[PDB]
Each structure stands twice: as C-alpha cells, then as structure tokens.
Amino acid sequence: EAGLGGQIFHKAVLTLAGYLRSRMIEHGSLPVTISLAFEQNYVSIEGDSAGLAELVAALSAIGNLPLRQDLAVTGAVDQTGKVLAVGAINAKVEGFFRVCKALGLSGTQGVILPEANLANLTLRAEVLEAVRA
Amino acid sequence: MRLSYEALEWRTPIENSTEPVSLPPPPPFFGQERAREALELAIRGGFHAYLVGPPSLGKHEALLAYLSTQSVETPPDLLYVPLSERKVAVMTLPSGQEIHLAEAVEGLLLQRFPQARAYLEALRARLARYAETDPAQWRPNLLTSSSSGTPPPIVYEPYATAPRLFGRLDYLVWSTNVSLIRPGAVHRAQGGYLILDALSLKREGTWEAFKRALRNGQVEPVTEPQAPAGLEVEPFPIQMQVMLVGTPEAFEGLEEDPAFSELFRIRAEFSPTMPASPENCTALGGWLLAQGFQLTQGGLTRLYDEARRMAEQRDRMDARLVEIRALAEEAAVLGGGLLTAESVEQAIAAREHRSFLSEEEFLRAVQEGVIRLRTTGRAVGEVNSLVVVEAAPYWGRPARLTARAAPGRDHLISIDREAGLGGQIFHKAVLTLAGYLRSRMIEHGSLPVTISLAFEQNYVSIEGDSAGLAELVAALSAIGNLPLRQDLAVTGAVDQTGKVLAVGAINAKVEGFFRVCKALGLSGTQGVILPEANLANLTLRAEVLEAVRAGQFHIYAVETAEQALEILAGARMEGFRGLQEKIRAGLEAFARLE
Amino acid sequence: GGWLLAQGFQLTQGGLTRLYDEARRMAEQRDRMDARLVEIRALAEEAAVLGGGLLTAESVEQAIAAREHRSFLSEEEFLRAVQEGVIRLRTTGRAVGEVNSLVVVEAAPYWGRPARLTARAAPGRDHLISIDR
Amino acid sequence: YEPYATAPRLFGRLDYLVWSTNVSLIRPGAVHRAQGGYLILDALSLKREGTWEAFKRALRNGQVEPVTEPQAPAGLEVEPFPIQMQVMLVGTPEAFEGLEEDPAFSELFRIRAEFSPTMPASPENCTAL
Numbered sequence A: 001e002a003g004l005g006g007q008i009f010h011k012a013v014l015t016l017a018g019y020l021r022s023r024m025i026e027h028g029s030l031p032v033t034i035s036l037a038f039e040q041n042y043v044s045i046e047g048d049s050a051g052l053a054e055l056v057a058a059l060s061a062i063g064n065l066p067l068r069q070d071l072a073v074t075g076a077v078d079q080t081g082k083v084l085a086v087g088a089i090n091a092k093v094e095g096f097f098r099v100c101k102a103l104g105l106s107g108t109q110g111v112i113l114p115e116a117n118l119a120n121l122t123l124r125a126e127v128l129e130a131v132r133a
Numbered sequence B: 001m002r003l004s005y006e007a008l009e010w011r012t013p014i015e016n017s018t019e020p021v022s023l024p025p026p027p028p029f030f031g032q033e034r035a036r037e038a039l040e041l042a043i044r045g046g047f048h049a050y051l052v053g054p055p056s057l058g059k060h061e062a063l064l065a066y067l068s069t070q071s072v073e074t075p076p077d078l079l080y081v082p083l084s085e086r087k088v089a090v091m092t093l094p095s096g097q098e099i100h101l102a103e104a105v106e107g108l109l110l111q112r113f114p115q116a117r118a119y120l121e122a123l124r125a126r127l128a129r130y131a132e133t134d135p136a137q138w139r140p141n142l143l144t145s146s147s148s149g150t151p152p153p154i155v156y157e158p159y160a161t162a163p164r165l166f167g168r169l170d171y172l173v174w175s176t177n178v179s180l181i182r183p184g185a186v187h188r189a190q191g192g193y194l195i196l197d198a199l200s201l202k203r204e205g206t207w208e209a210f211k212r213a214l215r216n217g218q219v220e221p222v223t224e225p226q227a228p229a230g231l232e233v234e235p236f237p238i239q240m241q242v243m244l245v246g247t248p249e250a251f252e253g254l255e256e257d258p259a260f261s262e263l264f265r266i267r268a269e270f271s272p273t274m275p276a277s278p279e280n281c282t283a284l285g286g287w288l289l290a291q292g293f294q295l296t297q298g299g300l301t302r303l304y305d306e307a308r309r310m311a312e313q314r315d316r317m318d319a320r321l322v323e324i325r326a327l328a329e330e331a332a333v334l335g336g337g338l339l340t341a342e343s344v345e346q347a348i349a350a351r352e353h354r355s356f357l358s359e360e361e362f363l364r365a366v367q368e369g370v371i372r373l374r375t376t377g378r379a380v381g382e383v384n385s386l387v388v389v390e391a392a393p394y395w396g397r398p399a400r401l402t403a404r405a406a407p408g409r410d411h412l413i414s415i416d417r418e419a420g421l422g423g424q425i426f427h428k429a430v431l432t433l434a435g436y437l438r439s440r441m442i443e444h445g446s447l448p449v450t451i452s453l454a455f456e457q458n459y460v461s462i463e464g465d466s467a468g469l470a471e472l473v474a475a476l477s478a479i480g481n482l483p484l485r486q487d488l489a490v491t492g493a494v495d496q497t498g499k500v501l502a503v504g505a506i507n508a509k510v511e512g513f514f515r516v517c518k519a520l521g522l523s524g525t526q527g528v529i530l531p532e533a534n535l536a537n538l539t540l541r542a543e544v545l546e547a548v549r550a551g552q553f554h555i556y557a558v559e560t561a562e563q564a565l566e567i568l569a570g571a572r573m574e575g576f577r578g579l580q581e582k583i584r585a586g587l588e589a590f591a592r593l594e
Numbered sequence C: 001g002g003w004l005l006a007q008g009f010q011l012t013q014g015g016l017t018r019l020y021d022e023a024r025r026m027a028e029q030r031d032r033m034d035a036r037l038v039e040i041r042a043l044a045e046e047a048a049v050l051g052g053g054l055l056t057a058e059s060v061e062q063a064i065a066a067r068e069h070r071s072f073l074s075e076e077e078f079l080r081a082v083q084e085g086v087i088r089l090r091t092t093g094r095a096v097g098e099v100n101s102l103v104v105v106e107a108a109p110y111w112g113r114p115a116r117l118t119a120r121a122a123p124g125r126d127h128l129i130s131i132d133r
Numbered sequence D: 001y002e003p004y005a006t007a008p009r010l011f012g013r014l015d016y017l018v019w020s021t022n023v024s025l026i027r028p029g030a031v032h033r034a035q036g037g038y039l040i041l042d043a044l045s046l047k048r049e050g051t052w053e054a055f056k057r058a059l060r061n062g063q064v065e066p067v068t069e070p071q072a073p074a075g076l077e078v079e080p081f082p083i084q085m086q087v088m089l090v091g092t093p094e095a096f097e098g099l100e101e102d103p104a105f106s107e108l109f110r111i112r113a114e115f116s117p118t119m120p121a122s123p124e125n126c127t128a129l
C-alpha cells in the first residue's frame, strides 16, 4: 500500500488472502482486518519469498498464538498453503546465523525453510558446525 | 470427443524413400497467384509496384527470375552532355550512336545526331568564343550502353544511399567537369527495372530525394562541401519501373506518406502460406533440385510435411521457400550430401536440441520439486493450464493454476491480473468468464462467493485469452468441491456463452505437456483437452502420435466448457448423481454461510 | 469526360459512366462525386491497360476488381478461418443475447466484417459492463 | 578474432598520399584476413560501434568497402567480392536480444551454440577442471 512492494510481492499477498479466506469460512466473510509490515524497511521489496512468514504472522495475530523468535522463516506459499522454493537460500540461512552469532547464540536458534530448497543448501562451514554441535 | 491416432495422423505416406527425385523447375510465383497477377499488371502497364510479405519468402529471388524473362526494345545510350561550363543534362541517343558522336566531337580538335542539338550548339558558341578570343570538358560522358533489351536492365541496389542511387561527382584538384560524373542505380536502370528495399530507403534517409526523382525528375549526383562551385544538373525524364520490396512492417512508415500510394499503385502481396497440395509438393521438389540439392523422395516428403507443421495447419504449407531451403541445407550435411527422410528428421531434431537449454532447466526443476506440478491423481480447484513462454522458439509448458472459493459478494479475482502481471486480452478473458459464471448461476441472486485464481509460480507477464477454459473449470471445481484429474492439462479460450474457442501454438502446448509427463514417468492416462476448433491445426510430432497410438497419451477435443469439466471431473452435468447438482449444493452452502 | 479526353485517354461512354459512378461510390454518397481527379485518372490508367488502350465499362469494372484482389489477403485469411470454425460466427438460426455486429478493421483498404457480440444478464445492481472497454 | 568491430578494423582503410590514392594504398581489415577461415566478433562491439548493417551487407551482398575520407576529391570504386569465411559471433543472452529482432540475424547465423551456466557436479567434471 505505501508503494514499497513490487508486483510479485503484491501477487504473494493476494495469494495469501486467497488461502486465508478459503480456510476460514464458517463465519461467512473473514470478520477481521489484518495488517502486515516489515518494520524498519525503507526500500523497495519484490519477490514472493516472504509469503510464508506473512502467513504465519497473520494466523498468529488471529489466534493470539505466541511464536518463537529464535526461528527465522523463509518460503513462498501458494493458495493451497503449500510452501514453495525461494532463491538465495544459503544467504538467507547464513545471514540469520550471523545475527544470532553477533547477539550471542542461545542454543535453540535456527531457520525454517522450504523442503523444496534441500538441494540448494550448500551451507558454509561455520553453520554446518553449529548445526553439528 | 476422444481423438484417435487415426484422427491425428497427418503426415504423408512415403513410398520408395530413397529414390532420387527428378522434377522440372516451377514458375517464379507458384502458390503466390495474387502477387503474380499484380506484377503482370505492373509489367504490362508500366506502373511502379511494391512486393510485400514476410521475411524468407524469397520475394527478391522470385522477382529477379520473373524480370529476367521480359524483353523490351534495346535501351538507348544514356549520357550527360555539357550545356555550359557549369550546366549538364542527361540525354538519350539511339543504341550505339554515342561512340559515333564522341568521335565527331573528338575530331573537332581542331545532322547525324538530331537529338544532340542543345549540346551541339552550346559546343559551337564555345568554339566561337575562343575564336572570338581547353578546357576540353565539352565531350559527352557515356553512362550506359547496351547490346540488347532481352533481358531488360535489372538493377537491384540493396544499399539505397544517395551516391548509390543518384551517382557521384569526382573533383580533380577544384576542378570538376561533366566528364567526372559517375552514374547511380537510377541511371543504370533506365529502360528497365530498379529494385530497392523499403527498409534501406528509410534507414538511409533517401525516401524524399527518391520521391523527387520519381515525381520531378530530379536526380542529382552527390557533391562535396569544399568545392568552390558546382555543376547544375538539369532534370531528366525518368524511364524505368521501380519495384520496392519489404515486410508489412517495413511499409507501415512509408504508407503514411500520401505520395507512396500515389507513386506505387501496384501492391504485390505474398501469402505466408499456400495450399498443401500435390502440385505445390511437386513445385517445391523441382525448386529444390534447381537449387542443386540431391533430393530423394523421402526427403522431399518430410520437408513438405515439415512446411505443413511450420504453418500449423494440416491443409496449408508454409510459403517461406528460403526457410525450407535453410533446413534442407542442414539436412544435406547430416545425410552426407543427400537429402533423405532421415537427414531432414535429424536436422529438425538438432535444431530443437540447439534451443532446448531453457526447457532442460525447466524439466530439471520440476523433477527436483523446485517447480511444483502434478501429472497424476485428482485435486479440487486445481488444473494444469498450458502456456507458452515469451521467447523463441516458444516451447509450451504446463502451469499449475489454482482457484479458491469463499463466502463473499460476486467477485472473480484474477491474482496475476490484479498484481499487474496479466495483459489486456488476459483481463478481457477473466471478465468474459465472470459474465458466463454470473449468468449461469442466478438462483440465489448475486453469486454468493469470492473466487480467486492464480497461476502458481508465475513470475512474468502473461497475455492472451488462451487460459480461459482452464480458469473456468478451476472456478467451477472450487465452487462445487469437484475433484479434477491432474493427468489432463487444458487449453482453450471460452466466450460468455461457455463455448470453447481456438487458441494459438497448439502443437507446442500439447508436446510440452507430453515432455513433462514423459520426464516424470508416463502413467498411461495423461493427455490434453483442447478446442475442437483447433483439430486442423494439430500437426503433432512423431513421439506424441506414437504415444497416442499406444494408448499411453490421450487428446480430447471439446466444444463447450461443460464438456471439459465432465471429462476432468469424471461425471455428466446431469443425472443426480451429476455435476450440476454438486455445483448447486456448493453455491447454496456458500449462500447460507453468507 | 472532357478532362479525361484532354489527358489523352480513348474513352467510351460506358467507360466514362462507370468512372463517374465509381467516383460517387468513392465519395460514399449517391449525390456527390469524389473530387480527386488524380485518383480517377490513376484508376483510368489501370483500366486502359486492361481494355488494350480503350477505356470501356468492362475495363473500369475489371480495374476495380483487380484492385480489390490485390488487397484481399487479409480478407481471404479471415473467410478461411470462419469456414474452418476458428472464428466462430453464425449466419442462420436464432440465439438469445447474441448478434452479428459489423466492424471495420483498422487498416487500408478498411474491409468490413461481422463480429459476434454477446450480452449476458444476471441479478445485480444496475451495471452495464462493456468487457472490451 | 577482432574484439573491436569498427568499420576500418573490419573492412580495411584507404591511405592517401598528397590527393593521390591508388590500389596500392589500400589496407585490409579483419574480413580480408579471415578469408578461407574464421572471423570471430563480439555481439556487443557490432552494436556499440554501429557496424551491424554494414557487416550484414558484407555477408549478404559481398560489399566490403575500405573506409574513406571526406576531403578526397574522388575515390575508388571497389567491386563486391565473393565472401569465403565463417563468422562466429560471441556474446550474452542479453547482448543478442537487440540483434535478434532483425530477421536478418537468424537468416545469417543459423547455428545457435548455447553454453549452460552450470554443469553436472561429477568426478569426471572435477577431473576435467
């Protein structure tokens, strides 16, 4: 709405609305307004790769469900709620490790990502060591 | 209706594959009767004409062969004569007579030629004046001479620059005189034909000056900035027919000038296809032998049948002889000099291999699950819609299309169109489908549902109405909770009345869903549903026709969107027992939920 | 007629009459004739070739026909696609909410064609929707 | 391999002695030097230098004109000649996009040789590397 999101990002939001509307039908129309923001983002963002994170945040806000902040999330979602492949998977993973590392590893941090990207994980040594530990 | 193998087979039976063909060279316009008749008029009447049609049809070759058969009386000698030390004119004298004047002239250091009066006088008054009181720039300058008019002069100048059209002045150091003028294509074409490309006239910026030559007779040799003075060149009467050549789109810019159609009154338009008949198969064979190919019957037959598939029509063949020849030239290498059925079929395969990287990446990502598709089982509100990705050579692929329905107030939402990925024609198809849906399901008042449709994992712009039938079946499936076959992909446009309409790239679509089914393992029950109105455009490749013959792939042709839904949902619209009932019950559940 | 004889044409009465009546049709008016003498002459020049030097009614009517043939490719493609059912049209029978509306396609010489126009009506709140618009 | 596809580098150059000019002062370009063999050019240089149309003309029509000067009172006519060479053009998918909307490109360059951005990670490609 503020003009920071591209066409593919917009598409991902409409897909997510399609999923949400169609899962929760018992009341008629969804009796809620849901707003989603990337806090402190000041630049244009494009891609559907934040869809799964927007969807979990939306179901959490509806259901009053506390979510783990030690697990970052990445993945695109289709209207049926299936998680889809995203690009730059190794960068994403490693960049959440760097932040967790810079603030002190707690032991329970990690990332949730699409099963369809398993074959693109070629993680750097430091992350594979942490996972092994 | 199911399309049997017998219904789909379209290729030409080959007897005695390896026997060498021997056939006479056809006439220059075979299968182009429109153009031939337009150019017969322009030749009989002296009109200028333009030859318009797609690239690679061989317009130029055909026109040069045609004009080479014409005859005209032997053209006159053409020359510049001085009328003064600063004036020149173009003149004609009867053929062979210039060499006689030039000698009469040279034997004037220190009548026979009535035509040369203007120059002869001007010559005397200068002799008078030098008596009355070197520079030897008073002789005629021969531009062309010719020994017959069979064939007439035929000048094709593909590079239409001003010095190439209109000639050039040389300076000796300035000095300049009538003797240093060189002719252009205009001069060389006098008493015959000048052939130019429409795109060169535009690119070189020479259209206006060429107009002036044809309209006003002004043909100025090109000059240099430096030269203290220069020669005046008198206009001259133009005696030539111009033939311009180009594509429909090369002509578009020239056509907004009124002067174009005043000056080029004969349009000779070449058709992109011709009848696929035994007489055009025969002309093609003689045309190939005359190009120097060693052709065999099987090779002529496969080329002929590949021209039909290039036209995407069982009844018509592609008219672009230059393209058939290019393919024949690659076939020849592969058959060692001999154009056989194998070598043609292998040339084709190699071309497909050479532009197959995008498709290999694609099929890999489907195999890895990076693109998520289904080619088996049933699923509600989903269907393999078939698409062609923007880019030559335009492979076809399945795209998973989903539809979700929820209680809401009649809204048919295309996500790709709302996100700006869908073009105007695609948008039109969605509104058509909403028009159909609203008007079929009226019992509750307004449609008590919101329906959203997305092409999953599409990241590019999509245009065309060719996904309409797949969007419509997905929408009725989501309303009615109807499981659809994922082993049948769908293609077709739909109108407001629910009739299925023709779509483009039908062979690509079909074959690209076969490739995906093949790459994931054929299950035996995969296939495509497509418009009955495209039957005549199915000229499927061998591997698909074989699979269909083996019962391992299936083509269904439909006339209405309801027939597609019955196939994909495995049940009739009526009975009880029937799809219409389940869609009713669906809509009523939504209506209550509202 | 006098203007044509002064240009050097060998004109006959039937030839002058058809030229005159083709100038009326070029104006698309029964009462007015097209004033473009250069255009009448160009047509007369093609007629002359076809009548062997003599401008007759046949040769004028045949010049006209040949010009229509020479720009008829688009229409031949069109009529073929209707005949094959690739363009779907009806020219017989009755149908609800459909009609052959007639159109001119952008491009010289501007042939006319039927276009099937459909209208669907449903319960809703006064909306007249032109899909093409 | 002429990476710098300017007209004088492709088609050769006329020298003038002071003008005078004659057949003896003509220098060859890459086109001449490539006769009976192979000429390699980059798609991006053809575009940047503006020499695509003139190179078309060389391949299509056999016109290979040495480059000339404005000043020169006159100049030499150069007859076309039959071209005997194979051209190999090199570039990215995006260097080709502009050349591909000309019909003449795919008429003249009938063999596309597309390099894949990745290959199999196998012990034989580890060994070749």
Ligand SMILES: *C(=O)[C@]1([C@@H](O)C(C)C)NC(=O)[C@H](C)[C@@H]1O
Binding pocket: A009, A045, A046, A047, A048, A049, A050, A086, A087, A088
């Ligand atoms: C995902 O599509 C993506 C995310 O950064 C944004 C927040 C959607 N967009 C991108 O360009 C990069 C590569 C991410 O994948």
Ligand SMILES: *C(=O)[C@]1([C@@H](O)C(C)C)NC(=O)[C@H](C)[C@@H]1O
Binding pocket: B386, B387, B388, B389, B426, B462, B463, B464, B465, B466, B467, B503, B504, B505
């Ligand atoms: C159909 O009109 C079509 C489909 O790819 C999209 C999904 C509508 N569009 C096209 O350009 C190609 C050629 C398909 O026909």
